[PDB]
Write a protein that binds this DNA or RNA. Structure first.
Lengths: 53, 50, 100, 143, 37
RNA sequence: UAACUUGGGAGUCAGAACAUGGGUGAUAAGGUCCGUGUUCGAAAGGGAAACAGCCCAGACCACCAGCUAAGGUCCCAAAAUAUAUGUUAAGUGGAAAAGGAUGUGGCGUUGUGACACUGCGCCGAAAAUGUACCGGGGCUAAACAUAUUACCGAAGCUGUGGAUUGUCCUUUG
RNA sequence: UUGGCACCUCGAUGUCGGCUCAUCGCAUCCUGGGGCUGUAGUCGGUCCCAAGGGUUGGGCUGUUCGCCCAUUAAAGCGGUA
RNA sequence: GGGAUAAGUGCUGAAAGCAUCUAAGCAUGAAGCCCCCCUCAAGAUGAGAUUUCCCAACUGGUUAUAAGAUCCCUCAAAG
């Protein structure tokens, strides 16, 4: 049947996390501190936006 | 397992569609005068000069 | 100015100067032959048709008299050892329609 | 012997436009499929599409009969285990009438390679405005 | 609410009706209502 | 227009389904055993969607001719969105009982109420990969009941030509 | 399920129970919505709609079923050789 | 959080001078349906769209070239 779970290439998906908070918006160093740990490696592009909920 | 049915000599050639080998990716040596392979030492006469 | 001639248990739409192919007629090569079974005549000329128009007829030159391509008639019953092959060259006669 | 066969240079094709307001779905779909295959014309030959181009308009206005709005469930399977989907004709008439009429008509044309050519001569719009002004479409009434 | 393939009036104030193509039995005594005739 | 006799030569001794009369079984079985019939066996063609045995019908061969058979005429898909009169609203048609019930039409008997027979419908009606009990679209007529026409429709029959066997001599044709 | 028949397979269609992975039906175990109760409330009983998700870990037994232990909202019933 | 709904509850109302949730019509009502949330997706051959870039010389057509992309090499956050 389609959807049968089999070995294949893993990871690399466009995953989204939700309801994180912003501990601090450091201006003049231009960084944001978010509560948690976000998808992607180091130097991985991340687009931040406000929660849909 | 074993093949249930012998392969036609059409399906064979289709599967060997991609059994090519590309050319090496060579150039001409400005010193030796002849063909070398790029980013390699010149076969014929000597130098690399890169 | 065409017509519809009944020749061999089949109708045929025939104009002048046309070569036609019919089942075997008794005449020999290069002969005249009058068709009487004409059920419908006229194109741009007139449009008259009865069971048989009975006033019009056709006249053709018997161009040739021969036999078609040999079709082989093969057929078999599978798993029951029965098969049968024949041949057949259906004879025809070709005609030139001289006048209507 | 003599039996005229339609060619690529023999054929003509015309544009019609039929109001799908107030018509029963199938009573109209049969007429339309007849037009599409092309046997309103005397140069009908099977191995070519001598039929015409048709533009059905007002597809948000066809009428069913009896309790067919709430009944007449259309099903479709997604080829994943257990995944079958359903929609009733009343919900397909307001959500997508241009798929209602298309599915009705395309189920009446053959499933062949030439039946899909003819299947994609149908142009269905839910509304009174069709962008094919540049085609000289003709009126057509249900015979 | 009784749901059984034979609805018939029990006491002489229970009346048979139809609703939605089902044969129902309305009745003041609330035990006596029935459907699926 | 077959039948018997006397001769030479065999094959067969696993039968199947369908209708029907029975036994057995459980008024189970595509069960099993017998009487009678048909078809398959050994039979292609058309209809039953597909489907040896069901209904129609027995292929010498060619034809781009005509008429019908079961079965059908809205589209897939050839031919009636035929005709006259009614019934059914359930998609019944297009799977099933006991029993229930101001569904509805006909007809008759009865003191606006009550009854016997009836036509068509409702409930009773729950299964596993996917709608999934019309072949599909779709249908309120493209479903039913009775009667008129038309037509489609097969390798059936007819027309034409041909090929082999025969029997009659019109005229050895 | 226990059977009946003997229609496919004996020039081969590999057994029961566990493990991995599941997927489907609904004749619903829990959770959702209701009717009636000989429903005071809590808690229930019996029907009705509902298949979205969930449905424990051990002892004994080859064991399935089955009994026991300790919980849980619950410890569903079946099909898929 | 919505829109439509099942069982259910109705509101108005004749068929049937009344009664009636139903036939017309109008409401409400589930973890279920369609949305909303997450992802993939224009080979969606019905092949969508927005922005930006490139565009000349000869013989019915062709050519190399342009924008662009690679062969080849140093690699990893990818494999």
């Amino acid at each position: 049947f389609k959807g049968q779970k089999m070995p294949g290439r893993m990871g690399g998906n466009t995953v989204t996390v939700q309801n994180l908070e912003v501990v601090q918006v450091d201006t003049e160093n231009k960084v944001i501190l978010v509560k948690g740990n976000v998808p992607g490696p180091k130097k991985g592009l991340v687009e931040i936006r406000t929660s849909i909920k | 397992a074993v093949p249930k049915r012998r392969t036609s000599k059409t399906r064979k050639n289709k599967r060997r569609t991609h059994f090519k080998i590309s050319v090496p990716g060579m150039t001409e040596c400005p010193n030796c005068g002849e063909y070398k392979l790029s980013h390699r030492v010149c076969k014929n006469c000597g130098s690399y000069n890169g | 100015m065409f017509a519809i001639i009944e020749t061999g248990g089949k109708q045929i739409k025939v104009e002048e100067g046309q070569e036609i192919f019919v089942e075997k007629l008794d005449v020999n090569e290069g002969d005249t032959f009058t068709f009487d079974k004409v059920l419908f005549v006229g194109g741009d000329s007139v449009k008259v048709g009865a069971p048989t128009v009975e006033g019009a007829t056709v006249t053709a030159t018997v161009n040739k008299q021969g036999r078609g391509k040999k079709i082989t008639v093969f057929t078999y019953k599978r798993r029951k050892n029965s098969k049968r092959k024949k041949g057949h060259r259906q004879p025809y006669t070709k005609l030139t329609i001289d006048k209507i | 012997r003599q039996t005229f066969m339609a060619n690529e240079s023999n054929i003509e094709r015309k544009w019609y436009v039929i109001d799908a307001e107030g018509q029963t779905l199938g009573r109209l779909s049969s007429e339309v499929a007849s037009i599409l295959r092309g046997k309103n014309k005397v140069t009908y030959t099977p191995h070519v599409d001598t039929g015409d181009y048709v533009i059905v308009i007002n597809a948000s206005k066809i009428e069913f009969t009896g309790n067919k709005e709430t009944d007449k469930v259309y099903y479709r399977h997604s080829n994943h285990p257990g995944g079958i989907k359903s929609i009733t004709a009343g919900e397909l008439r307001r959500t997508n009438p241009e798929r209602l009429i298309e599915n009705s008509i395309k189920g009446m044309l053959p499933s062949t390679r030439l039946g899909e050519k003819q299947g994609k001569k149908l142009f269905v719009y839910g509304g009174a405005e069709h962008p094919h002004a540049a085609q000289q479409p003709e009126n057509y009434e249900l015979r | 609410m009784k749901v059984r393939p034979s609805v018939k009036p029990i006491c002489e104030k229970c009346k048979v009706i139809k609703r939605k193509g089902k044969v129902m039995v309305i009745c003041e005594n609330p035990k006596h209502k029935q459907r699926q005739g």
